[PDB]
Design a protein around this nucleic acid. Structure first.
Ligand SMILES: [K+]
Ligand SMILES: [K+]
Ligand SMILES: [K+]
Ligand SMILES: [K+]
Ligand SMILES: [K+]
Ligand SMILES: [Mg+2]
Ligand SMILES: [Mg+2]
Ligand SMILES: [Mg+2]
Ligand SMILES: [Mg+2]
Ligand SMILES: [Mg+2]
Ligand SMILES: [Mg+2]
Ligand SMILES: [Mg+2]
Ligand SMILES: [Mg+2]
Ligand SMILES: [Mg+2]
Ligand SMILES: [Mg+2]
Ligand SMILES: [Mg+2]
Ligand SMILES: [Mg+2]
Ligand SMILES: [Mg+2]
Ligand SMILES: [Mg+2]
Ligand SMILES: [Mg+2]
Ligand SMILES: [Mg+2]
Ligand SMILES: [Mg+2]
Ligand SMILES: [Mg+2]
Ligand SMILES: [Mg+2]
Ligand SMILES: [Mg+2]
Ligand SMILES: [Mg+2]
Ligand SMILES: [Mg+2]
Ligand SMILES: [Mg+2]
Ligand SMILES: [Mg+2]
Ligand SMILES: [Mg+2]
Ligand SMILES: [Mg+2]
Ligand SMILES: [Mg+2]
Ligand SMILES: [Mg+2]
Ligand SMILES: [Mg+2]
Ligand SMILES: [Mg+2]
Ligand SMILES: [Mg+2]
Ligand SMILES: [Mg+2]
Ligand SMILES: [Mg+2]
Ligand SMILES: [Mg+2]
Ligand SMILES: [Mg+2]
Ligand SMILES: [Mg+2]
Ligand SMILES: [Mg+2]
Ligand SMILES: [Mg+2]
Ligand SMILES: [Mg+2]
Ligand SMILES: [Mg+2]
Ligand SMILES: [Mg+2]
Ligand SMILES: [Mg+2]
Ligand SMILES: [Mg+2]
Ligand SMILES: [Mg+2]
Ligand SMILES: [Mg+2]
Ligand SMILES: [Mg+2]
Ligand SMILES: [Zn+2]
Lengths: 24, 206, 60, 80, 98
RNA sequence: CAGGCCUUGACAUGCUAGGGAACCCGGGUGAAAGCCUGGGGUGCCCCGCGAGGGGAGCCCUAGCACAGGUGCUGCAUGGCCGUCGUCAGCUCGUGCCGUGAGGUGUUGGGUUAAGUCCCGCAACGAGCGCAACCCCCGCCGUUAGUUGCCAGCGGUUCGGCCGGGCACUCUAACGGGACUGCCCGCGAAAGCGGGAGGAAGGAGGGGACGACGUCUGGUCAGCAUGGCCCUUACGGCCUGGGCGACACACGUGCUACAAUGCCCACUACAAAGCGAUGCCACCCGGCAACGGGGAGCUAAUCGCAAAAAGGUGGGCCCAGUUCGGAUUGGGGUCUGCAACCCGACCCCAUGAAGCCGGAAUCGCUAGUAAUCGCGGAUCAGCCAUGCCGCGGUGAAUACG
């Protein structure tokens, strides 16, 4: 869920970007 | 713990800012500091003249500094040397090299800050507080003034227990926006402690 | 606002990070708005006196 | 999962001190107030008294201690 | 093609001192496309009422920057006559480009 | 808090006094602060050919008047705040009643969100409160076209991109509009019930606004301030530690326990805000944090930017799992003099408790609750899941 660093939603919640939430 | 400042409440309508100028985000804090130093130097000098207010305006490297005083004869000095020295201190503080003006206050008893300063003085001279208040309210009311109120804070009469003395008459509608109520505040530094003095004066409506 | 702590203003903080803002008026450390250079209390007081140009009470 | 960066940090107070020893010898102990300093191979075999905030603790350093800060070997709090 | 940006804390002062520029440029100049409002930049400051605790008090203030446009076509040299310096407003700041 | 130091001091004003004085650069020691030491340079005012003498500021030593204290007292206080309570109240002037404290008014009937209004009345009025004047959101208009639009035509690299135009959207100033004004019924009246027209009715929705006073309420640690107390330390500088301790107990929250769900891919709709030692388009390297390069933007014109839930397609098939991401090992990026104590972020591995929670207990009546994202203040960075704002989707129920 929103607490998983390795998930899209995890990134969105944590407000960061990365391998699991690209910047395109 | 209630009753917001009436001036601050009315700043949009029937009240206007003491400092009116525009500045950027990299500018504002500095010019504000300057204004503050100006008012701080002016109030600790011109007190004996009874300044009820200090207006400050700016465009570019120029500052209005319109000083409202009950007794302009004090700020003028002899032949105008006082205002010279004051402009000198002004230019020495801020290098902006700016102007100065003096506006007389007709009927100083119709301007709250002066009334409060009066009552404060009387209190510092060990007057009878209750009568000082009632008197002040009377003097304010007798000249124009559709309403008036004066409030003195605790340790009245040097008493061990703080108290609050009231004395208001006329109309003082603090909740009405169009009221146009002058407000003023003066301290009193005594041997036993400090007294707050508030002054409300209601003149006209729309 | 202890008087020695007003040593805050330093051309030589010895480090950029040791530099911290204070209230230019009362000397408050915490709650200092960068825009006004003031703290929050002074901010409200002066705002109420009308000494901050353009600053008005907000309602919506 | 720690990190620092390239250009590893060591305070130059003792950095020159330890190699100053190494030049002419071992000698005895040291007194260091900098616990923020990383451990480097040239320190191995020496003994460093590290300030825990109260006293100086005689930390002997070995080969497997390299890369940790001195302060890790000088615990600041007293518990039970 | 003279770009003008008028900024200030008083909508009255801006709006009134713009039409002065417009009327001054009407007689001596072109049709004067006239003030375009532009959006306002509102900066809010929320502050606790009390000096101690009481986190639920607040009463925030706002500081708003109004803007204006002008932008007179046909930069006539006859226009800068009534233009250049004649003005009432104090707390207005003016920007000008070509 | 431990340790190494400083004292007319980190800050203000003044006095006596020997001597040097404006000031610049070094060395020793040190964790830094500090202590010590050496070398450049002798402009001003007056007198004197000169040597030189005296002298103002300033700076260093010694002494004096003082600074300083986040040391105590919020029952010595100002100011400001919380609170009953946005509750419908609290009083005054004159008259009248009572020996008097006091009462009448302000009680009563009707009505209202309201001491709101009406009727009556030994009362007649009035003030602080209520309401209104202020702001935002709702419909329309005028003024204005660097935002908008094949509304309209011409061109189109078919992107409002070019020409072009203020009609629309929007932007932000002024103004209109709603007053039980109109109809029916009830009523003595104020008003109540319903209907028409209208974007909106009976206070249209939400803010700002909080009376006489109460709690010897909170704060001398934001500021101010009486009194008391310390003045080689209860003042001051620095290095390091601590405010981050952990057998435990409570409050407020976050993420969950899944299929009305989780994951991956593609695709669509917003508002309010911030941006020059700043936001950082786009290109390259990197799985990524991020690094290098670099356009634009004093910003309705560039950027943060991706909105998410939503829609389409596919995977999972009821299992502690493709639910849930704590804990821990390892490898890194960035800020910063410096991430051990004690930062956030990325990647690999790890994969805990948790199957909707005992007694008890909380919020909310409509665009509300629930749910989904977005921005900002402080700030180098950040322990923000906090606060203050913004919009998307959008319920249930109220007999009483
Ligand atoms: K009644
Ligand atoms: K309303
Ligand atoms: K009290
Ligand atoms: K449940
Ligand atoms: K959820
Ligand atoms: Mg998961
Ligand atoms: Mg008295
Ligand atoms: Mg102090
Ligand atoms: Mg800081
Ligand atoms: Mg700060
Ligand atoms: Mg590295
Ligand atoms: Mg409140
Ligand atoms: Mg003293
Ligand atoms: Mg108290
Ligand atoms: Mg108090
Ligand atoms: Mg207490
Ligand atoms: Mg108490
Ligand atoms: Mg009400
Ligand atoms: Mg309320
Ligand atoms: Mg009476
Ligand atoms: Mg009787
Ligand atoms: Mg009688
Ligand atoms: Mg009575
Ligand atoms: Mg009564
Ligand atoms: Mg009665
Ligand atoms: Mg009434
Ligand atoms: Mg009633
Ligand atoms: Mg009556
Ligand atoms: Mg319109
Ligand atoms: Mg523009
Ligand atoms: Mg435009
Ligand atoms: Mg038009
Ligand atoms: Mg009101
Ligand atoms: Mg704490
Ligand atoms: Mg324990
Ligand atoms: Mg034990
Ligand atoms: Mg507790
Ligand atoms: Mg883009
Ligand atoms: Mg790439
Ligand atoms: Mg555009
Ligand atoms: Mg689907
Ligand atoms: Mg599917
Ligand atoms: Mg798993
Ligand atoms: Mg289990
Ligand atoms: Mg299950
Ligand atoms: Mg249990
Ligand atoms: Mg139950
Ligand atoms: Mg309700
Ligand atoms: Mg931040
Ligand atoms: Mg943490
Ligand atoms: Mg956030
Ligand atoms: Zn302050």
């Amino acid at each position: 869920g929103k607490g998983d660093r390795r998930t899209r939603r995890g990134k969105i919640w944590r407000g960061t970007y990365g391998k699991y939430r690209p910047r395109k | 713990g209630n009753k917001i400042h009436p001036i601050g409440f009315r700043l949009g309508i029937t009240r206007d800012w003491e400092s009116r100028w525009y500045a950027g985000k990299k500018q504002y804090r500095h010019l504000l500091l300057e204004d503050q130093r100006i008012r701080g130097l002016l109030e600790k000098e011109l007190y004996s003249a009874g300044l009820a207010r200090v207006d400050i305006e700016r465009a570019a490297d120029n500052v209005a500094v319109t000083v409202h005083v009950a007794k302009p004869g004090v700020v003028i000095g002899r032949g105008g040397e006082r205002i010279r020295v004051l402009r000198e201190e002004l230019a020495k503080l801020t290098g902006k090299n700016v102007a100065l003006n003096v506006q007389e206050v007709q009927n100083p008893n119709l301007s709250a800050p002066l009334v409060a300063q009066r009552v404060a003085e009387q209190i510092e001279r060990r007057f009878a507080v209750r009568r000082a208040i009632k008197q002040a309210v009377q003097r304010v009311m007798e000249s124009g003034a559709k309403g008036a109120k004066v409030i003195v804070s605790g340790r009245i009469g040097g008493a061990e227990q703080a108290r609050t003395e009231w004395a208001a008459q006329g109309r003082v509608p603090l909740h009405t926006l169009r009221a146009n109520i002058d407000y003023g505040f003066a301290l009193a530094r005594t041997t036993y402690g400090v007294l707050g003095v508030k002054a409300y004066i209601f003149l006209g409506e729309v | 606002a202890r008087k020695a702590l007003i040593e805050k203003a330093k051309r030589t903080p010895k480090f950029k990070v040791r530099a911290y803002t204070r209230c230019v008026r009362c000397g408050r450390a915490r709650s200092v708005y960068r825009f006004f250079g003031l703290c929050r209390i002074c901010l409200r007081e002066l705002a109420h006196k009308g000494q901050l140009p353009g600053v008005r009470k907000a309602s919506w | 999962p720690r990190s620092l960066k390239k250009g590893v940090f060591v305070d130059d107070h003792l950095l020159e001190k330890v190699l100053e020893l190494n030049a002419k010898g071992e000698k005895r102990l040291i007194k260091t107030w900098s616990r923020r300093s990383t451990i480097v191979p040239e320190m191995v075999g020496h003994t460093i008294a590290v300030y825990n905030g109260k006293q100086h603790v005689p930390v002997y350093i070995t080969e497997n201690m390299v890369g940790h800060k001195l302060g890790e070997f000088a615990p600041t709090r007293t518990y039970r | 093609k003279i770009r003008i940006k008028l900024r200030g804390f008083d909508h009255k002062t801006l709006d009134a001192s713009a039409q002065k520029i417009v009327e001054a440029a009407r007689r001596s100049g072109a049709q004067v496309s006239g003030p375009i409002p532009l959006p306002t930049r509102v900066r809010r400051f929320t502050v606790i009422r009390g000096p101690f605790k009481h986190k639920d008090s607040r009463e925030h203030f706002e500081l708003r920057t109004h803007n204006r446009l002008v932008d007179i076509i046909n930069p006539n040299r006859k226009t800068i006559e009534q233009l250049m310096t004649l003005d009432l407003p104090t707390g207005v700041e003016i920007e000008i480009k070509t």
